[PDB]
Design a binder for this molecule. Structure first.
Ligand code: N4I
Ligand code: CL
Ligand code: CL
Ligand code: CL
Lengths: 99, 99
């Protein structure tokens, strides 16, 4: 599809058996999801920007379904105000910016 | 152009006659630029970032060129990790997400 930017580009995703709403975010290096359980080992990470930094848990090799497109990669879990699909997963679904 | 997301989608912008590097950020509602001198009056604006909310300066109807494309619109000035071109101006230049 082609998604315009008049409003936030929100999509439904499936992660860890749960449906969530998330923002397709080209400014995000990482994918960042609100608190939830994920399988496997994790390690702590800090990410930051406007308003400062938050601590998150980094899980690797997590499968996410985004608009019918399955992709695998690292997911950070923590107190993000909005679920974010970042570049590490946007690349996997072949998402580009066009103008 | 078509910009893939394997690296940060950084482009050159021109604002106040000066070239700067900025990030095309679909997650950002607004355009936020590092401290610089802009003309006219400003109004207060609160924006919510990954780490929390901050106040920035809002300048309206500012001329800005993004990857060679001309836009005229609202630019916020404040402490930002990088210069950010958000949805307000991405929409002006006809930028869409495609997959
Ligand atoms: N209202 C707005 O216009 C406004 C909202 C949020 C932000 S933001 O939180 O700073 N922000 C932009 C951003 C851009 C670049 C960087 C960088 F380069 F330092 F890594 C860090 C952060 C947000 C906005 N979109 C990208 C980033 N997403 C959250 C985030 C934050 C940090 C790491 C992540 O993986 C993800 C900026 C602007
Ligand atoms: Cl990854
Ligand atoms: Cl590609
Ligand atoms: Cl605007």
């Amino acid at each position: 599809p082609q998604i315009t930017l008049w409003k936030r580009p929100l999509v439904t995703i499936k992660i860890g058996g749960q449906l969530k709403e998330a923002l397709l975010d080209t400014g995000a290096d990482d994918t960042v999801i609100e608190e939830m359980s994920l399988p496997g080992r994790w390690k702590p990470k800090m990410i930051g920007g406007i308003g400062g930094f938050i601590k998150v848990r980094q899980y690797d090799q997590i499968i996410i379904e985004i608009c019918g497109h399955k992709a695998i990669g690292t997911v950070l879990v923590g107190p993000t105000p909005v679920n974010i699909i970042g570049r590490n997963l946007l690349t996997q679904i072949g998402c580009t910016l066009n103008f």
